[PDB]
Structure 1
């Protein structure tokens, strides 16, 4: 067993998890040409690629959403100064003052 030790060292808890004992091809032709890939290995490399795309998609949406909020904050302030620089010069009591 000893899964706690393996997790401490960075390896998988189960020795069948993404270790060098699993990823590498178990058999090859004698002459030296590579063997056809395993069905399991190809499937395992499809969910990892799918997982990586999800991380990139999630990271970009959060960053893009943050940018939109900053734009609105600047837009709100720029609109406020527009009203100040668009009204008329208050004459009122300042004419006699």
Structure 2
């Protein structure tokens, strides 16, 4: 078994997980030309590609959301400054002083 040992060493808990024992092709022609790809390997590649695409999409969405929040806060600061900039000069209690 040794799933805990394999997890500690970094390998998959199952010897059939992404190891070279399964990722590599298991046969080829005696002439040296490569064999057609395995259906299981093709499906695993498709799933890994989908997972990577999802990871990239999630990271990009999180970055975009953080940037949008920062931009909103900055625009709030700018409009708060502009409200004071567009005001008038006080004359009520300042002219008698």
TM range (shorter): over 0.9
Question: Which residue pairs with 1:88 in the alignment?
Answer: 88
CA-CA distance at 1:93 after TM superposition: 1.4
CA-CA distance at 1:66 after TM superposition: 0.1
Structure 1 stretches (4+) deviating beyond 6 angstroms? none
Match of 2:8, SS? helix
Q: CA RMSD in A?
A: 0.5
Match of 2:93, SS? helix
Q: Deviations over 1:35-92 (max 9, x none)?
A: 1011111011000000000000000000000000000111001101111111110000
Structure 1's unaligned 5+ residue stretches are none
Question: Which residue pairs with 1:26 in the alignment?
Answer: 26
**Scaled by the length of structure 2, what TM-score is found?**
0.98
Asked if 1:43 is matched to 2:39, the reply is: no
CA distance, structure 1, for counterparts of residue 94 and residue 38 of structure 2: 88
Structure 2's unaligned 5+ residue stretches are none
**Scaled by the length of structure 1, what TM-score is found?**
0.98
